[PDB]
């Protein structure tokens, strides 16, 4: 048998292999694998509910607790004030210890472990004139929960 | 999520990975069809100089080869979509969606 | 095919989930006094949960609980926990307002 017929034969074989791979991953979507590891919540739907591909409402929610982000807001007037104070007037430069200082919970109690800050949003909101800055915090024994009101203290010059 | 938030990004830099798993398979299919029709058209191009094969057969063999060559590019751009690139240069905000989430 | 509104509903009345809520500041002070100071020592019957209906009468049976929602709500500022209750005579209906009675050490 000539080489071109063999090329057509294994070309059709590889195309069918790709098709059965498509059917295999469509079979794998029927068992909803957890995309990440973490603590899971309460299932929004139970056994017997009809669900469609790409629906908006979720069926359950998994989330990771350690570490934990905090998002604190700052008015832009204070930001430009400290920015004009860094380059004018008296000395204002914190240095290497300008990472982060601690957090205060909703009950006013102090948090033992200090975190670290990294900037993640420069687009001032038009509703309140404030920017959102972001920090990370270790959470070893899960005493922090996502979505609670907190007061983060932080460093300047 | 292949970027640090709040950092500058250049145009064309990869930002995420959307777990292709389908576009890879149809890329394999298009690659197989191209690998068949390419050597088909090459053998017909070698034969058409000695007039062993007609010019019409070389014509539509080259046509089918270019058709498969277009289909494999149509798969390759879908592979390029699964690594979403920054369309411009500049600052980036924080990621509103994170890893493990389904996007449509 | 795939319309949003349903045609009918089927429900299993036995057992019954009881989703109760508590504010996060109460959980915070309970976790603070649970470790610091005197030890509350929750013990063995911390799983035990009994409820009362809205008329004040006690439910005769008794059920256990398990934690199922680790995230605090943004609007309410409260954390919700869940309990399982046996309902052999369909005395509890889904949507009833009840008062659970916990045991914090």
Automatic annotation (TrEMBL), chain A:
Sequence ranges assigned to domain Multidrug resistance protein MdtA-like beta-barrel in this UniProt record: 67-157
Subcellular location: Cell inner membrane
Family statement drawn from the similarity comment of this UniProt entry: Belongs to the membrane fusion protein (MFP) (TC 8.A.1) family.
Protein name: MexA family multidrug efflux RND transporter periplasmic adaptor subunit
Encoding gene per record: mexA
TrEMBL record, chain B:
Domain called Multidrug resistance protein MdtA-like alpha-helical hairpin: residue spans: 21-82
Domain of life: Bacteria
Record-annotated Multidrug resistance protein MdtA-like barrel-sandwich hybrid domain positions: 1-104
Cell location: Cell inner membrane
Stated family: Belongs to the membrane fusion protein (MFP) (TC 8.A.1) family.
Name the UniProt record assigns to this protein: MexA family multidrug efflux RND transporter periplasmic adaptor subunit
Organism per entry: Pseudomonas aeruginosa
Name of encoding gene: mexA
Residues represented out of the complete protein: 136 to 239 of 442
């Amino acid at each position: 048998v000539s080489k071109q017929q063999y090329a057509d034969a294994n070309a059709a074989y590889l195309q069918s292999k790709a098709a059965v791979e498509q059917a295999r991953i469509n079979l794998r979507y029927t068992k909803v694998l957890s995309p990440i590891s973490g603590r899971i919540g309460r299932s929004a739907v139970t056994e017997g509910a009809l669900v469609t591909n790409g629906q908006a409402n979720a069926m359950a929610t998994v989330q990771q607790l350690d570490p934990i982000y905090v998002d604190v807001t700052q008015p832009s007037t204070a930001l430009l004030r400290l920015r004009r104070e860094l380059a004018s007037g008296q000395l204002e430069r914190a240095g290497d210890n300008a990472a982060k200082v601690s957090l205060k919970l909703e009950d006013g109690s102090q948090y033992p472990l200090e975190g670290r800050l990294e900037f993640s949003e420069v687009s001032v909101d038009e509703g309140t004139g404030s920017v959102t800055i972001r920090a990370v915090f270790p959470n070893p024994n899960n005493e922090l929960l996502p979505g609670m009101f907190v007061h983060a203290q932080l460093q300047e010059g | 999520r292949l970027f640090k938030e709040g950092s500058d990004v250049k145009a064309g830099q990869q930002l995420y990975q959307i777990d292709p798993a389908t576009y890879e398979a149809d890329y394999q299919s298009a690659q197989a069809n191209l690998a068949s029709t390419q050597e088909q058209a090459q053998r017909y191009k070698l034969l058409v100089a000695d007039q062993a094969v007609s010019k019409q057969q070389y014509a539509d063999a080259n046509a089918a080869y270019l058709q498969s060559k277009a289909a494999v590019e149509q798969a390759r751009i879908n592979l390029r979509y699964t690594k979403v690139l920054s369309p411009i240069s500049g600052r980036i905000g924080r990621s509103a969606v994170t890893e493990g989430a389904l996007v449509t």
